[PDB]
Amino acid sequence: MDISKPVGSEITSVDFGILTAKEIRNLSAKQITNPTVLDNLGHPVSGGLYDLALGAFLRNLCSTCGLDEKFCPGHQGHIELPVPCYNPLFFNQLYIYLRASCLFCHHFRLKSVEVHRYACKLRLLQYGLIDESYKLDEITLDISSTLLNELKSKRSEYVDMAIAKALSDGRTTERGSFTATVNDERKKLVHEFHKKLLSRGKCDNCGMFSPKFRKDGFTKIFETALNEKQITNNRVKGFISTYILSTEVKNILDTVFRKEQCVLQYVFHSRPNLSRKLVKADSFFMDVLVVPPTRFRLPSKLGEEVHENSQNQLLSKVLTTSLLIRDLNDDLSKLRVIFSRLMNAFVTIQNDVNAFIDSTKAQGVPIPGVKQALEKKEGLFRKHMMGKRVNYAARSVISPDPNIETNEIGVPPVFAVKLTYPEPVTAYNIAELRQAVINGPDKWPGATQIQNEDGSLVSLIGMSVEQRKALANQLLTPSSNVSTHTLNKKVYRHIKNRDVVLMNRQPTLHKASMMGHKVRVLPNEKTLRLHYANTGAYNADFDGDEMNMHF
Amino acid sequence: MYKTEKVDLALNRNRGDPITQHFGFGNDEWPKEWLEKLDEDGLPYIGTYVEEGDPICAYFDDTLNKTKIKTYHSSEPAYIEEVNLIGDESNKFQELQTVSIKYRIRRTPQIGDKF
């Protein structure tokens, strides 16, 4: 963080959504088709996981932004799946909507008036009006279509009026009101809706029975058994277990999500859908896979050994299976066994991406999936977001000292010559910093580095007293460049006796175990000196205890 | 405090492969002031003071055709107490690259030490 570098733009909110296949194909830097990562000699193979279009790799420049490994941010690529696959995270949901729909009229087997009742209640809940959603159940007139359509009209009329009335006042905005109790009422309804949806056996719209769908641990759906009484009605339908492909499920849900778009609009939107986007079934399916930039898939180097990328092992396996199955299905054109291995390949590709993402929900040690990467131990959020390893910090055994102030900390000269503060050079402190610059990085109070107004850094580490003296007489020189006239030089000066430090003694059971102390550099010291008044708050006894110092 | 290190040249070679490596110093190529720590044989002088970065041994590998060194790295400086040269076995014949080096680290009672 640099005060000379302010930021004018800020993230105000984050929106959660699903990437569309059409969206990924356009943003993609290169299509990945090759399971090999390196050509002979040592150059990355074109169309492979290490392609230079995905960013700078192996002292080569990026073939998209042209920058080197340092400045190149890396670029996303894509894998074209030869057949659509169920997205593991949203399989349970697409399964619920598959079991809840009629295979004939392609509507949910629940009566349209009952479905509309949920759509009404869920629309009123997009805005903070729970009382109105319950008052809708009071609106009441084997039942004729002319009568039921009037009930849907009267209910829609109340919904449109209740929204407009609350919208007129400060009860709800155009973006809709959203509270935890509102969220509780939404969560209750979306649950009740799916429960009523799954309960119906015979379709209430068209009286024909649909064949029940069963599932296994892995993402795979199949047909169900059927007693004689169920048979007697599937034949009078027209008078009045087998595996189902991913394409068949997508095609069933495609029509159902079109025909039932009104309710799903509010089932999938927490607040009103101002973007007016269509709720499509292909969101639950993967026709492509995004290839993260080379930057986040670099091979781990431990000493001399350069390990193959953990991600590139399972990802190349998916590409081998993908290329093998698209060719093993291509020779079938010039035609049992070929259908057997075709289906078996259709299963091992779905299980390959399932292994690419997760384990405990795969096999039964396998390579960890992206879900496993976010939940390795405590998780990415707990280990690297809520908590982080920090710069400008030190650790040492604490030793008692009654000669320092109760608000002070005895800092060893070892820490004082390494821990620096970015002090901007001005007219009021030119004298103080000139000395620090002359003193250098090994003489306290000194300076390890000097930052010019152009943004560049000048290390004082290798320099002798002569160069340091010259740079000190160049600290308060006016900026020739008009693009940096606003800026002034900075001196990365040693920690002085006027500085603040955060003393921490773990476990930090209460905020008193993390206080601010005044730095007091004590010569010929190898330990952090602490006064006896601090012993209680830190719950620290000088029995060989350790404390963290943050600068 | 005494610490022992094993410098084995069998780290990459296996199953009697030809070796590009050898204890000592290669001709024509010689980076400045290394002779201050190591003797003609490439092994260090027993008694020499060493700090992190200083060369603890010297060798030459034919695969890279360059004279490389195994660096000493620790926050505590030491002195060489014992250097042992070990036969490589493996039907003998091969020269003894292998080697056990003992470091003597002097430890005066410091502020923090338990009694």
């Binding site: 850094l457 | 970065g53 790295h73």
Partner: peptide, 27 residues
């Protein structure tokens, strides 16, 4: 060779904790 506007001169020196050019700058 670094390649910065500055000129390295070779003989790069490794400092534990800091890899610096013998000359102008340090990574």
């Amino acid at each position: 060779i670094c390649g910065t506007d500055n000129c390295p001169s070779r003989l790069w020196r490794i400092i534990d904790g800091r890899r610096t050019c013998q000359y102008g700058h340090v990574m």
